[PDB]
Amino acid sequence: AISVTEVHARHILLKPSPIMNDQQARLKLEEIAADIKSGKTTFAAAAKEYSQDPGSANQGGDLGWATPDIFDPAFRDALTKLHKGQISAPVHSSFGWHLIELLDTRKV
């Protein structure tokens, strides 16, 4: 009986640019993360304000349900280690830098 596990993830993406190099992108995510953790903002509000992924920014960063092989492998690796409520440290993918949360898992 072969299993298929879907994950429910959310994230905030920042891409480097000429205004924002890689160091500035990572440190900005650290500042967002500490704002979420200190109740200055919610994860969803920050996703809406800052996330540079237009496929999810307006849905509070929500990625829906998916088998995790759809994700960049660095994103997938980080997702694997996360407990309920926990936000990742900033994670680099081919897309830029991410804050990641694992919301749930299920079998389909």
CB 103 within 8 A of CB 9: yes
Q: Which CA distances in Å does 6 have to 3, 38, 92?
A: 10, 30, 22
Q: What is the resolution of this structure in A?
A: 1.8
Alpha carbons within 13 angstroms on the beta-carbon side of residue 53 total: 23
SS3 content of the chain, % helix, strand, coil (to 5): 35, 30, 35
Per DSSP, the three-state class of 62 is strand
Query: Where are the domains positioned within the chain?
Result: 1-108
| Residue 78 CB-density burial (10 A; 0-12 exposed, 13-18 middle, 19+ buried) | buried
CA 48 – CA 33 distance, rounded (Å): 14
The H or E element containing residue 12 is strand 5-14
Alpha-carbon separation of residue 23 from 32, 50, 76 (angstroms): 14, 16, 22
Experiment type: X-ray
DSSP code at position 90 = P
Tell me the pairing of strands 62-66 and 91-93.
unpaired
Expressed in angstroms, the distance from the first to the final Cα of the chain is 12
C-alpha 31: how far from its chain's center? 15
1-108: CATH number: 3.10.50.40
Task: Give how far the C-alpha of residue 39 lies from the chain's centroid of Cα atoms, to the nearest Å.
Answer: 18
Spatial separation of the C-alpha atoms in residues 91 and 96, rounded to whole Å: 8
- Residue pair 5/67 in contact (Cβ under 8 Å)? The answer is yes
CB 12 within 8 A of CB 47: yes
